[PDB]
Design a protein around this nucleic acid. Structure first.
Length: 138
RNA sequence: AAAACUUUCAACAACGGGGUUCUCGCAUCGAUGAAGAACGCAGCGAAAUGCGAUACGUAAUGUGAAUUGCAGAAUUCCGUGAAUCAUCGAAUUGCGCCCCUUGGUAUUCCAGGGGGCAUGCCUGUUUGAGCGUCAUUU
């Protein structure tokens, strides 16, 4: 209980937004939530707070990561989908990044087959510039 | 089990770096403590009061046994004498003398109360003294 309490707290840590190691945090969150499938209320509370934190981030790769995780956590814990029928997702459906929008749409629609696991180092700004200047060359 | 490492930016954090002398002008002094300084002062004090390095003060005059929160001196006390005492004209708390009036066993001794008296010098009033000089039978 104390570990999940500290994780639910650290989700609101402001320094997390500018942390290079957000991928490790993503993997840790996925593993923790997967291991807690029995506590439906607790995992739903983490899902809600995860979206809360995501709404105010600038790193695209992390946001795509959370959406992919939520999609996968939905498979192990289908009761998470009840929240969509029983509000934040509307913003991500209207996110500026097309990839984030598609991931959100897939999570809402449940259409998971067209999602590759998002990879950090992709969607980052330098990579976008490398595409956008039209000269990558491997 | 995807991070570390080097380099360059960028933040953020450490680290880091009154006197003295000269010149110029202005003219306004008080024995009643100016302007300026500051320990804050008392044996141990915060305010109040008192004071000025002579600092809860020094001198002089008076009174007469205290001060007081603590400590400590004592006052040879029958008085040259404490007092955060008084007055105040300039620890010396220096050095004194005597008169008047009442009582307590009172001729001794004691206790109160009152009043003067420092010294020098000038003038005058009063009182004496000198083997200093002298008159003294109308």
């Amino acid at each position: 209980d104390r570990y999940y309490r500290t994780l639910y707290e650290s989700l609101f840590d402001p320094r997390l937004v500018n942390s290079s190691k957000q991928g490790i945090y993503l993997n840790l969150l996925y593993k923790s939530l997967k291991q807690d499938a029995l506590n439906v209320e607790r995992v739903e509370a983490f899902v809600k707070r995860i979206l809360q934190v995501c709404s105010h981030w600038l790193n695209v790769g992390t946001i795509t990561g959370f959406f992919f995780l939520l999609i996968q956590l939905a498979k192990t814990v289908p009761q998470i989908k009840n929240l969509l029928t029983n509000w934040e997702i509307n913003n991500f459906i209207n996110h500026f990044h097309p990839t984030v929008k598609t991931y959100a749409n897939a999570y809402v629609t449940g259409e998971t087959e067209q999602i590759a696991k998002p990879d950090l180092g992709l969607f980052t700004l330098s990579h976008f510039l490398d595409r956008f200047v039209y000269r990558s060359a491997k």
